[PDB]
DNA sequence: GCGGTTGGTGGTAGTTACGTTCGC
């Protein structure tokens, strides 16, 4: 079976960059050879078909070269809509097999996140548990780095994270943070902080309550 | 228009069986193949096989053929894939797809895609999430949809009404092996005790519906 | 006019370039 090798696996440039993606394959395809773009919860998308041809609709930015193991998708004025997986596709030998994905980031200028702190609500508390939620909003870079201080303490090691796929539009970030507690142990300490740190932040932010 | 409606996804133990349809409409069925193409979560596209809409002659990759069955009924211009001893590894979306209106002269290109339909095959059981408020010139506030199980749940606010500045964020899992997420949205704060606001959570494996208040 | 987004007959095949189509 025939081995599709993207490089790179994954990319961050700014609007208007020329970007090229490569795909290596393992044995010569005689120039059968389809890229696809895949947005987040999307299906995957033809933009280039049989090594060079532009499907109908894409626009014209997108380009494809190559022959026997070595082909490029050139993006020749990267937009913020570009954010995507690319896979590159061969139909030479069945089975057809697919490269294993480049993801494309577009880079903006910095910006810092917004930062809010959720104390658990009644309802979740009456159950027993206590969640307490931090949210920094609309942010770029990815990179944020988020510490839990309760009464002075750290429990950062405790909490889980999630991030928003890169916006399609602003190419800003969201993330949560997440510290689960028994009631028990929420009732044990009085102060709950998120230290949010950041490229565009020029000193820590801490947003912080104390429990009722 | 020509589109391809899929359908049948849903969570199976380990050893189960599943049948997925894909549903064609608004070109000449039997003029072209039906592929399939799966994609386990975060992770990048494979090719499970295609059958001939004319002939009934499938193709299936790898060791596919074991445990995977082609099928048509042109009657319904539809196309099955049935899927037995199923595995863990089998958790995946599970596309549909077709070449161009022209492939010849090797135009051979996936097309056009169903909507894509997930498999889950897990030992652990369907469970409903709890909806908790996250209480709020700019407030954020939210929805945490807590303890769910398999994926997915969808989120709106308002019944879809406000789009603007909602971020519904990826499911963790956690240690206990089930999922959680919160939705949020950025308000003005003077809405506080003006505009309600509800989130709807669907999360359709349990048939679990909730709208809830979120209150300043 | 001429390349796709289409229509229609045949048919064991990606079947596929054609015409009756569609759209700049």
């Known amino acids: 079976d025939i081995q599709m090798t993207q490089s790179p696996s994954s990319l961050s440039a700014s609007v208007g960059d020329r970007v090229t993606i490569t795909c290596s394959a393992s044995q010569d395809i005689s120039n059968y050879l389809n890229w696809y773009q895949q947005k987040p919860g999307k299906a995957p998308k033809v933009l280039i078909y049989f090594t060079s041809s532009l499907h109908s609709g894409v626009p014209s930015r997108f380009s494809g070269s190559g022959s026997g193991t070595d082909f490029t998708l050139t993006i020749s004025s990267l937009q913020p809509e570009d954010f995507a997986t690319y896979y590159c596709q061969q139909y030479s030998t069945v089975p057809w097999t697919f490269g294993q994905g480049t993801k494309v980031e577009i880079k903006r200028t910095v910006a810092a996140p917004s930062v809010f702190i959720f104390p658990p609500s009644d309802e979740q508390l009456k159950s027993g548990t206590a969640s307490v939620v931090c949210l920094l909003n609309n942010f770029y870079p990815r990179e944020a780095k988020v510490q839990w201080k309760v009464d002075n303490a750290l429990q950062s090691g405790n909490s889980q994270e999630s991030v928003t796929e890169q916006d399609s539009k602003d190419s800003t970030y969201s993330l949560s943070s997440t510290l689960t507690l028994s009631k028990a142990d929420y009732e044990k300490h009085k102060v709950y902080a998120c230290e949010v740190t950041h490229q565009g932040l020029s000193s820590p932010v801490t947003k912080s309550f104390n429990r009722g | 228009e020509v589109q391809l409606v899929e359908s049948g996804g849903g969570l199976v133990q380990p050893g189960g069986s599943l049948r997925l349809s894909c549903a064609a409409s608004?070109?000449?069925?039997?003029?072209?193949?039906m592929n399939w193409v799966r994609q386990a979560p975060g992770k990048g596209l494979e090719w499970v096989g295609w059958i001939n809409t004319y002939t009934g002659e499938p193709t299936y990759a790898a060791d596919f053929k074991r445990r995977f069955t082609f099928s048509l009924d042109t009657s319904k211009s539809t196309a099955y894939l049935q899927m037995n001893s199923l595995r863990a590894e089998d958790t995946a979306v599970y596309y549909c797809?077709?070449?161009?209106?022209?492939?010849?002269?090797?135009?051979?290109?996936?097309?056009?895609w169903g909507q894509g339909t997930l498999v889950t095959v897990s030992s652990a059981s369907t469970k409903g999430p709890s909806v908790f408020p996250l209480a709020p010139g700019t407030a954020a506030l939210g929805c945490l949809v807590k303890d769910y199980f398999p994926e997915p749940v969808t989120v709106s606010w308002n019944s879809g009404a406000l789009t603007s500045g909602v971020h519904t964020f990826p499911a963790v899992l956690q240690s206990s092996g089930l999922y959680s997420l919160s939705s949020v949205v950025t308000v003005p704060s003077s809405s506080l005790g003006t505009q309600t606001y509800i989130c709807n959570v669907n999360h359709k494996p349990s048939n679990t519906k909730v709208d809830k208040k979120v209150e300043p």
């Open positions: 608004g070109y000449t069925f039997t003029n072209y193949g």
């Open positions: 797809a077709k070449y161009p209106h022209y492939y010849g002269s090797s135009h051979w290109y996936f097309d056009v």
